[PDB]
Amino acid sequence: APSMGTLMGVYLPCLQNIFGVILFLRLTWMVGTAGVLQALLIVLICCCCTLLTAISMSAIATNGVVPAGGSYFMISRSLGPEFGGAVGLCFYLGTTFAAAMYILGAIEILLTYIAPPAAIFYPSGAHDTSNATLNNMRVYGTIFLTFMTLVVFVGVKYVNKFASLFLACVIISILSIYAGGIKSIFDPPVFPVCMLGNRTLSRDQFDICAKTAVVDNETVATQLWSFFCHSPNLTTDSCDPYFMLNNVTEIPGIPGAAAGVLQENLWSAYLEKGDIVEKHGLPSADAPSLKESLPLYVVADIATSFTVLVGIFFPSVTGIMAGSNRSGDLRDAQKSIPVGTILAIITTSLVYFSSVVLFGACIEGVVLRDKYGDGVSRNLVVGTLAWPSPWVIVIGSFFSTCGAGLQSLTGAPRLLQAIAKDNIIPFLRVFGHGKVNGEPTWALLLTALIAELGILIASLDMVAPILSMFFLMCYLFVNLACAVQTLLRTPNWRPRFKYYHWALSFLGMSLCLALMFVSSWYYALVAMLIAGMIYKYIEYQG
Amino acid sequence: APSMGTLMGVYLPCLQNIFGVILFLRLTWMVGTAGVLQALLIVLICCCCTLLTAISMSAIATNGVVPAGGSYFMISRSLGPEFGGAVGLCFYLGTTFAAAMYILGAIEILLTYIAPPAAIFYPSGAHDTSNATLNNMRVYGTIFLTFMTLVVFVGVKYVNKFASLFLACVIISILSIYAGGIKSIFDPPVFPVCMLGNRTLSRDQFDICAKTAVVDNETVATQLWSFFCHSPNLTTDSCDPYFMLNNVTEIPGIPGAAAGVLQENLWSAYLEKGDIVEKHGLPSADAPSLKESLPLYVVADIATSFTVLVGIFFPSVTGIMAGSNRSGDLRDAQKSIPVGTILAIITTSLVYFSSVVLFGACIEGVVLRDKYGDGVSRNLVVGTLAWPSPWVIVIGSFFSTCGAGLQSLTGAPRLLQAIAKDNIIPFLRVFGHGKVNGEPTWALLLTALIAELGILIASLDMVAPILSMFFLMCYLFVNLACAVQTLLRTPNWRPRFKYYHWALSFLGMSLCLALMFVSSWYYALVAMLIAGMIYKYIEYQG
Ligand SMILES: *[C@@H]1O[C@H](CO)[C@@H](O[C@@H]2O[C@H](CO)[C@@H](O)[C@H](O)[C@H]2NC(C)=O)[C@H](O)[C@H]1NC(C)=O
Ligand SMILES: *[C@@H]1O[C@H](CO)[C@@H](O[C@@H]2O[C@H](CO)[C@@H](O)[C@H](O)[C@H]2NC(C)=O)[C@H](O)[C@H]1NC(C)=O
Ligand SMILES: *[C@@H]1O[C@H](CO)[C@@H](O[C@@H]2O[C@H](CO)[C@@H](O)[C@H](O)[C@H]2NC(C)=O)[C@H](O)[C@H]1NC(C)=O
Ligand SMILES: *[C@@H]1O[C@H](CO)[C@@H](O[C@@H]2O[C@H](CO)[C@@H](O)[C@H](O)[C@H]2NC(C)=O)[C@H](O)[C@H]1NC(C)=O
Ligand SMILES: Cc1csc(N(C(=O)CSc2ccc(-c3ccccc3)nn2)C2CC2)n1
Ligand SMILES: Cc1csc(N(C(=O)CSc2ccc(-c3ccccc3)nn2)C2CC2)n1
């Protein structure tokens, strides 16, 4: 018999789950590659679909009748059980796999940056190859998932504390990054980046960045010159003409917040796979490039385009259902779910916009698209923006991913119990009537096993678009259910009196159905096929 | 009401399906990497498991009661329907996917070698990237699969003709390769291979193989010297010391059949990924190797070991069920299936052994492990062994793969109909009572759709071990069923009177159950789980 109210019941969980980790790490890459304007447009599109879905859900919940079950109950009541069951099952699978991926990301964040100094779990995998890190993940993520499932098994009263602490840490990290940005505007930090000609080269091989140097009144080896130039004598031009013709120089990578940098970084620059990231302002002579010289540069990892960028970014904006599916507590959910969801979504969108604009206007353009940090000692560029130190941002990202995973894991069992509580799927009957007070039991086991299988895979990033397709399908179905319910003599209305809600819901449904289509039609077809199969099975069961 | 007799009914299909294409292309790689002795041992192990399964099947069929259905009916009658249904379903899936992979391999053989000159289907894909070839396959394989399904739909009376022609072509290719081997023993061909120091380098960049040459009474550019050495003047040692210190030379790659080559090629040589294949007899100085010089060599593709080699080779020895599942024709199958299966299996094993020994004793060891042909103009080494020309061997391989795919496609519907003919699986009832005369109809559609999905994947090589696991599970279950049936008061006995059949079946079952385990336990666990799920579903249906 829980009742979590509005603020903690539906606002904090949604905001905490929405943030993810894309803001801390991939946001700089996106802004650098697509420019400020295109990044703003893409974030606006994603937030627009999410806000339209939230508004449709609020309109549906205005009736104040949802007793239990998340969006699945609403969809089943409005449209019909046959579609509602399939949508709920797909959404539950997506939520479980998203929780698994969040936990994996948190574990890998911890391994790479959190405590690599403590052997970076070297005994766990010994770093023989990528398999070593994969095993380290497969073990540590499982060790953490067991604890997460154990904690979530107890009533949510003991779950909201950890989520609140994680959200507090994430907010602290965001405030620190903004303070670092303002300080850089008032006092730029130090962050040298090595650029030869007008290109950029990873500063991980040579100790110093200079074609020639003088030690003991004599020319030096110039380790940089040693690479791509095997002649250790100054009076020699044997190696590639690029070194001799072009010139090497060092430029700040974090010139702070200034009008010039932001204005120069406005437009976008998409590069195909294998290209070399190079600044445009400074000069560079043209000469043939030796094949061996290619590795000693900065090369794009994947092709860059608006559609691919939108597909990559969209998942970071999902998870608005944390406060929707969770309905056991929060008495009088009618007056709580919509306001909380809208507030959290709007705050997240505003923070995303401000962060993207600041990143565009603060950091040097060349560094931004230098993904993986190979350009500068592989260290986190955004971390240096943090006021105190990169540790604050790294720990913030780790806690954010862990908390998002925990919130998704907590949410999934409620939806599973709601689906099974109704005799809609014959073989899910046992997964109902959990512990007293309505807590989900005997379904937490199923969700935990699903997450454990996902962890055992330890490569869920391969099937990235499947979860996005599931989430978009659920949102589109919610929008359509709201539209039909309003059409079919729905008295539920906000203070504004009009029929424009029909058009709004249709616009959102079309918008981020085409969104999923452009993201990956290849997997959208598979997701639609799975939904159809579940719908046919439901029809057979009747 | 068909009756195909013994020879054509059960012998020709099994033998023509067993051959595959591994003999023509990968056999040389296996013999070169693992040596003659280890290749003989591995082929012996695979053929031993296959022959033990065949003998167990013959013992079971000695009762002369199998009216219809392949190994599934035997297993269900002996052990029990619960296991039989699951084993039959897994075997049917494996056969369908094997047919799809065979058709894909045939299409890719045609694209790469059959008719690349006819634009190599350039308009189909334009060769923009690997996606171009993938689309070419996805289209041509479907175009061929539609025709294959259409032909197989008609009674087998119109199917055995194409299989007979394909088997005739394959036998012609085998005879040609043996004749070429004997001729090389009596008259070695010409096949220069470029070796620097004691290593080997692909002869695809430079026109001639010589560190220096004289044209117009002057030193030449020496294109080979241009690669890895960018100084175009003879009086210069700027480039890597390997070229100057070591010496480059040309050696025959096909010295014919001689005692020395075979004796020197006896022992094995396993190399880890990234290694460089080098001969042992000739000398080679030691000096540092430049990083850029690495690509201009011959590098192993994957790690080499006995277990991985056995796992790779085993699928080339399966398919002995072609004459077993097909039982609609061949009246009095009791006196036909065992003799035909044993004869075909023994002939295939003998041909494999002889071919491996000849390959070991004929071709130069260095070339053998030069997979993909990059060592010598990417052209098929085994093709040059053919007496008339490589075209005979290439067409033989293409026809062999096409025929194997066609035979598997023909076999699958019979097993599907047999499974559905019995009300064991509730939802397979519709897939029964095909066209008159017992021909499979309304199940050929399902098998064709499964094959079409596999083609659309066009990358079935990724899940290679799954089909191997399915086949090994089916064979092991057949062996266990034979053992139990003989134990449970089975009067079926051959002229030899003894109870050693129990021990023989147990030995085979253990042998190539551990075979699948060593091949891939990772996927063996998944296959076992799928079989258990099918068994539980069957139990529920009762
Ligand atoms: C890299 O070195 C070149 C050297 O030419 C610089 O271009 C100028 O070249 C003239 C020719 O002797 C010199 O007198 C100038 O001193 C050079 N300019 C400078 C600033 O040194 C080129 O400018 C150098 N790179 C950069 C970024 O300045
Ligand atoms: C860095 O330098 C390159 C080349 O110097 C410039 O981009 C063009 O590159 C082509 C090479 O095919 C040159 O022919 C052009 O002269 C270069 N400038 C143009 C086309 O305006 C550019 O300065 C930089 N390239 C980037 C930033 O991608
Ligand atoms: C590659 O060239 C070397 C050159 O040293 C050959 O080794 C011998 O070196 C001496 C030293 O001058 C020469 O007089 C000999 O003529 C060289 N031998 C030969 C056969 O030319 C080395 O033998 C050469 N490579 C091969 C495979 O013979
Ligand atoms: C080809 O040459 C290599 C090296 O010259 C020989 O294998 C050994 O390689 C190591 C390199 O670390 C040398 O130190 C040894 O002197 C080489 N010979 C040995 C260990 O007996 C060998 O002749 C050839 N390598 C092959 C065939 O793999
Ligand atoms: C060390 C590190 C750096 S960056 C990083 N990352 C993360 O920590 C995120 S892992 C992740 C990815 C996707 C999803 C997801 C959620 C909902 C729907 C679809 C997908 N969830 N979680 C990933 C590469 C960006 N790890
Ligand atoms: C151009 C070319 C060269 S070599 C080649 N190959 C082929 O043509 C064979 S494609 C193939 C592979 C596996 C199976 C199979 C059958 C039964 C059970 C498990 C696997 N069937 N078919 C493949 C790489 C060797 N193509």
From Swiss-Prot, chains A, B:
Carbohydrate attachment residues: N131, N198, N217, N233, N247
Parts of the chain on the Cytoplasmic side: 59-82, 327-336, 418-440, 485-498
Post-translational changes noted in the entry: Phosphorylated, phosphorylation may regulate transporter activity.
Binding-site positions, K(+): N17, I18, Y102, P315, T318
Subcellular location: Cell membrane
Positions on the Extracellular side per record topology: 28-35, 112-134, 184-305, 360-390
Annotated S-S bridges: C194-C209, C229-C239
Residues reported in the UniProt entry to bind chloride 2: Y475
Function in brief: Mediates electroneutral potassium-chloride cotransport when activated by cell swelling. May contribute to cell volume homeostasis in single cells. May be involved in the regulation of basolateral Cl(-) exit in NaCl absorbing epithelia.
Similarity comment: family membership: Belongs to the SLC12A transporter family. K/Cl co-transporter subfamily.
Protein name (Swiss-Prot/TrEMBL): Solute carrier family 12 member 4
Organism lineage string: Eukaryota, Metazoa, Chordata, Craniata, Vertebrata
Protein encoded by which gene: SLC12A4
